[PDB]
Amino acid sequence: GKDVPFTAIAGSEIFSLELSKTEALTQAFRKSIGIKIKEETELIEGEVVEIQIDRSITGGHKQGKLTIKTTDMETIYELGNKMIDGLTKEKV
């Protein structure tokens, strides 16, 4: 199955020019033992209804409103300056 390391090499694959034979065998040995780490993260996955951007002449202070929703809820977010920069880049 998946998630379990399986390193299938040939016998002629370790005669390298930049690595010794024992070093290549050590790398092939250590490619087959894995560490399983579980972690948790939080995400906002949604559908953008409306983006409102207020900009100044010199670009000093930016204001932002984001109406965003799922098929279940609906909300409006006030946005800080770095979120304005991160939404202008990779244009949503």
Partner 1 sequence: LLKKRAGKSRFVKPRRPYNSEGMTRILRRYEEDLFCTF
Partner 2 sequence: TIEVLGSSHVTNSINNELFDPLISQALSDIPAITQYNMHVKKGIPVEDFPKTGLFPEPLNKNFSSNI
Partner 3 sequence: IYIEANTGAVKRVGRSDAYATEFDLETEEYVPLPKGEVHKKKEIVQDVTLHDLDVANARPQGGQDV
The piece of 20-28, 44-52, 55-63, 66-74 that touches partner 2 (CB under 8 A) is: 55-63
Structure tokens at 85: 């920069």
Residue 4 binds partner 1 (CB under 8 A): no
Give me the amino acid identity at 58. Answer: T
Residue 45 binds partner 2 (CB under 8 A): no
Q: How many CA atoms does the CB half-sphere of 23 hold within 13 Å?
A: 6
Assign 3-state DSSP to the chain and report helix, strand, coil percentages, each to 5: 20, 25, 60
- Scan residues 41-80 and list those touching partner 3 (CB under 8 A): 66, 75-80
How many chain residues interact with partner 1 (CB under 8 A)?
Answer: 14
Kindly state the DSSP code that residue 26 receives in the 8-state scheme: H
- The binder of partner 3 chosen from 82, 88, 89, 92 (CB under 8 A): 82
- The binder of partner 1 chosen from 56, 71, 73, 82 (CB under 8 A): 56
